Design a protein around this ligand. Structure first.
Ligand SMILES: Nc1ncnc2c1ncn2[C@@H]1O[C@H](COP(=O)(O)OP(=O)(O)O)[C@@H](O)[C@H]1O
Lengths: 15, 341, 692
C-alpha cells in the first residue's frame, strides 16, 4: 500500500 | 483516503476498455482500441507498468485514452476446458491386477510433488511425464489410472485428435495455449490419450493437410521437447495403437517411462467382477467362475456393462437383486452383442 | 463417590475438604475405578489422584495423571513449603524416571513432560528456590524455556558438560540465540576482551592439533587484524614461541595471497601498459587504486606511483600512495617505515596534499598497532593540528585506530575533539559523523555520555543528531534502537541509520517499520530511505531490492537514482544475474548529463562480479567492448575516462575475495563511512570514497 500511495500521488504532476 | 477521491475523478466516471499495443520507454505506450486508435499515455499510477505487456487490457480514460489502471479478465474458453474438477471418487484402489503395472507411474506422478525427499536428494529427477498404451479398446482403462491422479495436484485433460485438426490451422496454436496455460497454473498435469492425429483420415470441414497435421504434431513435440521450457505441467500420454506414433516423440519425451497394458488374467477378471458387484445385490446362485471362464479377454467396463444390463432387466422385473439366470441371459445380450457385431 | 455411576461433578478440589481422613485410605480403592473400562469418572478421578500421588512424591505418575488434566497441575495445594518440597522431590525424582535405559530414548516439546515442567516451573521461577530439573534433566527444549528475561551478556556461561553434550548443547543454544541480539559469534565484536573467550576459543579445538587445521589455520590466516591472533596468541598453547610463525599474518597473507594467485588472476601488462600509452587521464581520480590492489607487491610501478604523485596534482596521489603501502603490506608488514614519511614530508594544508599519505599508514595498517604504529599515528597527527584541521583529514584518521582495536586504551577522540571550536556546522556533518563514530565501538555507555556533554555543552544543534547516532552505533542491535527512534526528528536521519544499524538479525522483520517510515515519513526523507538496504539485505537482496529500487531507478531524481543505485550497490553486487546485465541496457542510453548517469550504469557494472577473474574466469574482452563503446560519447566529458577505470577498480583489482566482506559477520568500516558523504556528492568527497 505505501508504494501504491506514492504511486497514486504522482498524478498531480502527471495531469 | 484522499487519493481514492482524487484518481476517480480523472478516470471517472466513464472510461474505455483499451488494449496495449506496444510500449515506448517514455512511459508513453502505443495503445489500441476499436478502431485503429493509437496514442501516447504516460502515467505513473496503478502501474505495474512492467507486468502489463502488450496484448493485454489497459483502461482508457476518455480524456484522453489515458490509462488509470489495468484489468486482467479471463474466463477464456480454454481456462473453462480445464476444470471442474472432478476430484473423482475413483481411486486406483477401485481397480485391481495392475498393481505392478501402476506402481511405477504412480511413483513418477507422486515421486515429485508429494514425497520429494528421496527424489530431490537423489539428484535424479525424471519429471518428463509418462506414456501409456493398451489393447483392444482400453486407455480409458488407464483413465482408471489417471482418475486416481485426478485426486491430487492440478490437472487438465486434453484428448483426441479432434481438438487439433478440426478447422484450418493455426496448427498447434491450440496446443500452444494448452502448454502455456498449464505452465501458468504450474504445478499441473496434462493427460493426452488416443492420439489419432495420424490415425484419423478426414479433415473436418475444409482443412489441410496430412503433413500440416504432421507438422502440428511436430510442434507438439518441440513444445514438449522443448526449447526451452522447464515448466511442469507433466504430460501423460496414452493410446490404443503405438504403431502409427512416430519415434520423434519418444527420445525427447517420454524417453524414460512408458507402460504396457496387459489383458486381465483369471484372478484379475474375478477381482474386477467383485469390484463392480460390490454395490449390486446379487442372488445366492450367482457364480463368477463360469462367467470369467466363458468370457474371453474382457476388461472392467465389459463385465461392468453386463452388470448394468443385469440390473436393467432386474428393473424390468423391479427386483433390487439380480438373478443368475437373468445375469446369464442379460449377459447373453452383450455376449451375442459382440457376436452380432 | 469417585466411582458413582453418576457423572455428577465434582471429584476435583474435594480432597481439600476432607484430606487427612481419606489419607487413611490409599490408591487401592482408586485402581478398580480407573482400570475398569466402561466406567464413570475415568480421567476425572485423576484430578483427585494427582494430589495423592503428588503428596506421596511419586513421579511420572503425576506426569501420567496430569496428561488429560493440563490445567489443575498449575494451581494445586497454599503454603509454599510442600510445594518446593515435593517440587524438588518431584524434581530430582522425575529426571531419575528419565533416561533410564541409559543413553536416551529421550523424552517421550510434549504436552506432558515439557508442559508440566513449564507449568510448575512457572511457580518455580516465580518466587522461591532455583535450579529446577532444567539443570538436572538435560533437555535443551525446556532449556529454551529455562531462561527468563534478563540481560544475556552474562549468560555466555553454562555447566561444563562433555564435548558430546557440549556440541548439541551449543547448537540448540545457538539456534536459540540467533533471533536474540547477541549470538555465539559475539567473540568477534565483544569487548568482552577478557582472556576467557580466547581461552575457550583455543580450547574448543583443544587438545587435537591435527584435525585442528580448520578453525585454527583458516582463522589465523583469514585474520587481517592482530587482536585475535594476539589474545589468542597468548591463548594458543600449541608448541612454544614458534606458533608465532603461523601468526602475525606474514606467512598468512603470503599463503592465502598465493592461493589467490592460484585462483586468479588480473591482467597486468596488456591493460596497464596500453593505458600507459594514454599518459594521464583527466579524472585524476580513480586510476591510482588500480595499482593499489593490483600490485601488490611490485616495486617498479610503485616508483611511477610516487614519482608521478610528487607533482601533487589534486588528490590523484590517493590510490597511488595507497598502493605504496598496500603493495608491500599485501603480505607483511610493510612499508610502514616509509609509509608515513610523506605525511610530515608534505602543514598539509589539506587532505589531498599531506593527508593522503596521512591516511595511508592508518588504513594500510590493518592490524597495527603492533604496537608502534598506534603511537606513531597519534604522534604524527598531534604534530599537524591547525593545518589538518578539524575537517578534511580528521574524517580519515580514526579509521587507523578503531579498525584494529575497539577497546583500545588510547583516546584519540579527545585530542582530535579539542579542534572542534571552528564552529562550522556544515563540514562537521560529514566530518564529525564518522569522525566521532570511527574512534571505537566502545560498549561502555559512558563514552557517548562524555562526548555528548563535553562536545555539546549545550549542543551543536546539528551534531547531536549524529551523536545519538554514535550512541545507537556503540551498542549493536540491542533492540534499544526501535526505542531510540521515538524521537524521529524533522531531521529524521536518526531513523534511517537507526534502523540501518539498529537491527542486525538474520530474519529481516524490519519490513513493517522500514516501509512504515517511508509511507508515514515526511517528504524527501524517502531519499534517505533506500540507504538502509546495506545491512538487513545481506540475506536475500535479489527479491526485494531490484523490486523496490527498480521503481526508484527510472525516477528523474538524480538523488534517489544515485542513492538507489548505491542502495543496491555493494550488497547487490554479491552475485550476478541476467536481469542485471540485461537491465544495464538503456540505463546507459539516457540523455541526462552529470556523474549520476555513469555512477548508475558504471556502478551497476561492478555488480556483475567482484575480484573474480580474469583468467579464470569470466572473459575481460566483453567489458573492454562495453566500456569501449560507451566511451565513444561526449566525447570528453572526462567522466567517461573516469568510468572506464571505475568498473575495473573492483573489476581488475581482484586479489581479495568478498565474501562478503565478511562471512564471519564483521563489517567493512570504510564503506559505510565513505558512502555516507557523497549522498550530497560535490567535489572531492567522491574520491575520498574512491580510496576503495
Ligand atoms: N481392468 C479394469 N479394472 C477396473 N476398471 C476398468 C478396467 N478396465 C476398464 N475399466 C473401466 O472401464 C473404462 C474403460 O475405458 P475404455 O473404453 O476401455 O478405454 P478408451 O475409452 O480409452 O478406449 C475405464 O473408465 C475404467 O473405469
Amino acid at each position: 500500500a505505501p508504494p501504491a500511495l506514492w504511486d497514486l500521488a504522482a498524478d498531480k504532476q502527471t495531469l | 483516503e484522499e487519493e481514492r477521491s482524487k484518481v476517480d475523478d480523472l478516470r471517472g466516471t466513464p472510461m474505455s476498455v483499451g488494449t496495449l499495443e506496444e510500449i515506448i520507454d517514455d512511459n508513453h505506450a502505443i495503445v489500441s482500441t476499436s478502431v485503429g486508435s493509437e496514442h501516447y499515455v504516460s502515467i505513473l499510477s496503478f502501474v505495474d507498468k512492467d507486468l502489463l505487456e502488450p496484448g493485454c487490457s489497459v483502461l482508457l480514460n476518455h480524456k484522453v485514452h489515458a490509462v488509470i489502471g489495468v484489468l486482467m479478465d479471463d474466463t477464456d474458453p480454454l481456462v473453462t476446458v480445464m476444470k471442474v474438477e472432478k476430484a473423482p471418487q475413483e481411486t486406483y484402489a477401485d481397480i485391481g491386477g495392475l498393481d505392478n503395472q501402476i506402481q511405477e507411474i504412480k511413483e513418477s506422478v507422486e515421486l515429485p510433488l508429494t514425497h520429494p525427499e528421496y527424489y530431490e536428494e537423489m539428484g535424479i529427477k525424471p519429471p518428463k511425464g509418462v506414456i501409456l498404451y493398451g489393447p483392444p479398446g482400453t486407455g480409458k482403462t488407464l483413465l482408471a489410472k489417471a482418475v486416481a491422479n485426478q485426486t491430487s495436484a492440478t490437472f487438465l485433460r486434453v484428448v483426441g485428435s479432434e481438438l487439433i485438426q478440426k478447422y484450418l490451422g493455426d496448427g498447434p496454436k491450440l496446443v500452444r495455449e494448452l502448454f502455456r496455460v498449464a505452465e501458468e497454473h504450474a504445478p499441473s498435469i496434462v493427460f493426452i490419450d488416443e492420439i489419432d492425429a495420424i490415425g484419423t483420415k478426414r479433415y473436418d470441414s475444409n482443412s489441410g493437410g496430412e503433413r500440416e497435421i504432421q507438422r502440428t504434431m511436430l510442434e507438439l513435440l518441440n513444445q514438449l521437447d522443448g526449447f526451452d521450457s522447464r515448466g511442469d505441467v507433466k504430460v501423460i500420454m496414452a493410446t490404443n495403437r503405438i504403431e502409427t506414433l512416430d519415434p520423434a516423440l519418444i527420445r525427447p519425451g517420454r524417453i524414460d517411462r512408458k507402460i504396457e497394458f496387459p489383458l486381465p488374467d483369471e484372478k484379475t477378471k474375478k477381482r474386477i467382477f467383485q469390484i463392480h458387484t460390490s454395490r449390486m445385490t446379487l442372488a445366492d446362485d450367482v457364480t463368477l467362475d463360469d462367467l470369467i471362464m466363458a468370457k474371453d479377454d474382457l476388461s472392467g467396463a465389459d463385465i461392468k456393462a453386463i452388470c448394468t444390463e443385469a440390473g436393467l432387466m432386474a428393473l424390468r422385473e423391479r427386483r433390487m437383486k439380480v438373478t443368475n439366470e437373468d445375469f446369464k441371459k442379460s449377459k447373453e445380450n452383450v455376449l451375442y452383442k459382440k457376436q452380432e457385431g | 463417590m469417585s466411582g458413582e455411576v453418576a457423572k455428577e461433578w465434582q471429584e476435583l478440589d474435594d480432597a481439600e475438604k476432607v484430606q487427612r481422613e481419606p489419607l487413611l485410605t490409599l490408591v487401592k480403592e482408586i485402581v478398580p475405578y480407573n482400570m475398569a473400562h466402561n466406567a464413570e469418572h475415568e480421567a476425572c478421578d485423576l484430578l483427585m489422584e494427582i494430589e495423592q500421588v503428588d503428596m506421596l512424591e511419586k513421579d511420572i505418575d503425576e506426569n501420567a495423571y496430569a496428561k488429560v488434566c493440563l490445567y489443575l497441575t498449575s494451581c494445586v495445594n497454599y503454603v509454599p513449603e510442600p510445594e518446593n518440597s515435593a517440587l524438588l522431590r518431584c524434581a530430582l525424582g522425575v529426571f531419575r524416571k528419565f533416561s533410564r535405559f541409559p543413553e536416551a530414548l529421550r523424552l517421550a516439546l510434549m504436552l506432558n513432560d515439557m508442559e508440566l515442567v513449564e507449568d510448575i516451573f512457572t511457580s518455580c521461577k516465580d518466587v522461591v528456590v532455583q535450579k529446577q530439573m532444567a539443570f538436572m534433566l538435560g533437555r535443551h527444549g525446556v532449556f529454551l524455556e529455562l531462561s527468563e528475561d534478563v540481560e544475556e551478556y552474562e549468560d555466555l556461561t553454562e555447566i561444563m558438560s562433555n564435548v558430546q553434550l557440549n556440541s548439541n548443547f551449543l547448537a540448540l543454544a545457538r539456534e536459540l540465540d540467533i533471533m536474540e541480539p547477541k549470538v555465539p559469534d559475539d567473540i568477534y565484536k565483544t569487548h568482552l576482551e577478557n582472556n576467557r573467550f580466547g581461552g575457550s576459543g583455543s580450547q574448543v579445538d583443544s587438545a587435537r592439533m591435527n584435525l585442528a587445521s580448520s578453525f585454527v589455520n583458516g582463522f589465523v590466516n583469514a585474520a587481517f587484524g592482530q587482536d585475535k591472533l594476539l589474545t589468542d596468541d597468548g591463548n594458543k598453547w600449541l608448541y612454544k614461541n614458534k606458533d608465532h610463525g603461523m601468526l602475525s599474518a606474514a606467512a598468512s597473507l603470503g599463503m592465502i595471497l598465493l592461493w589467490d594467485v592460484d585462483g586468479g588472476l588480473t591482467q597486468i601488462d596488456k591493460y596497464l601498459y596500453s593505458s600507459e600509452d594514454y599518459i594521464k587521464s583527466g579524472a585524476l581520480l580513480a586510476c591510482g587504486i588500480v595499482n593499489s590492489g593490483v600490485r601488490n607487491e611490485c616495486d617498479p610501478a610503485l616508483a611511477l606511483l610516487s614519482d608521478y604523485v610528487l607533482h601533487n596534482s589534486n588528490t590523484m596521489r590517493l590510490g597511488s600512495i595507497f598502493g605504496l603501502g598496500l603493495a608491500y603490506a599485501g603480505s607483511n608488514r610493510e612499508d610502514v617505515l616509509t609509509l608515513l614519511l610523506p605525511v610530515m614530508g608534505d602543514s598539509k594544508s589539506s587532505m589531498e596534499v599531506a593527508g593522503v599519505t596521512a591516511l595511508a599508514c592508518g588504513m594500510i595498517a590493518v592490524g597495527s598497532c603492533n604496537g608502534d604504529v598506534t603511537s606513531t599515528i597519534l604522534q604524527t597527527i598531534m604534530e599537524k593540528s591547525e593545518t589538518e584541521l578539524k575537517d578534511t583529514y580528521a574524517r580519515w584518521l580514526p579509521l587507523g585506530l578503531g579498525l584494529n582495536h575497539l577497546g583500545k586504551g588510547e583516546a584519540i577522540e579527545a585530542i582530535l575533539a579539542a579542534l572542534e571550536v571552528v564552529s562550522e556546522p556544515f563540514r562537521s556533518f560529514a566530518n564529525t559523523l564518522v569522525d566521532v563514530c570511527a574512534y571505537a565501538g566502545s560498549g561502555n555507555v559512558l563514552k557517548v555520555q562524555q562526548l555528548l556533554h563535553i562536545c555539546s555543552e549545550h549542543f551543536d544543534s546539528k551534531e547531536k543528531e549524529e551523536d545519538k547516532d554514535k550512541k545507537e552505533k556503540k551498542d549493536k542491535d540491542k533492540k534499544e534502537a526501535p526505542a531510540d527512534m521515538g524521537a524521529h526528528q524533522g531531521v529524521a536521519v536518526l531513523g534511517i541509520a537507526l534502523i540501518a544499524m539498529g537491527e542486525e538479525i538474520g530474519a529481516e522483520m524490519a519490513l513493517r517499520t522500514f516501509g512504515h517510515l517511508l509511507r508515514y515519513g515526511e517528504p524527501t526523507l524517502r531519499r534517505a530511505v533506500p540507504l538502509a538496504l546495506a545491512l538487513i539485505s545481506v540475506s536475500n537482496p535479489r527479491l526485494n531490492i531490484l523490486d523496490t529500487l527498480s521503481k526508484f531507478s527510472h525516477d528523474a531524481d538524480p538523488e534517489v537514482s544515485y542513492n538507489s543505485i548505491f542502495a543496491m550497490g555493494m550488497v547487490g553486487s554479491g552475485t550476478n544475474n541476467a536481469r542485471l546485465a540485461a537491465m544495464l541496457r538503456q540505463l546507459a542510453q539516457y540523455h541526462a548529463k552529470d556523474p549520476n548517469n555513469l555512477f548508475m550504469v558504471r556502478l551497476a557494472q561492478g555488480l556483475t562480479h567482484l575480484g573474480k577473474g580474469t583468467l579464470t574466469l569470466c572473459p575481460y574482452h566483453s567489458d573492454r567492448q562495453l566500456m569501449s563503446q560507451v566511451a565513444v560519447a561526449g566525447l570528453l566529458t572526462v567522466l567517461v575516462s573516469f568510468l572506464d577505470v571505475r568498473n575495473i577498480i573492483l573489476g581488475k583489482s581482484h586479489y581479495v575475495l568478498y565474501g562478503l566482506v565478511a562471512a564471519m559477520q564483521p563489517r567493512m568500516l570504510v564503506t559505510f563511512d565513505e558512502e555516507l558523504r557523497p549522498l550530497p556528492v560535490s567535489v572531492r568527497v567522491g574520491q575520498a570514497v574512491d580510496v576503495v
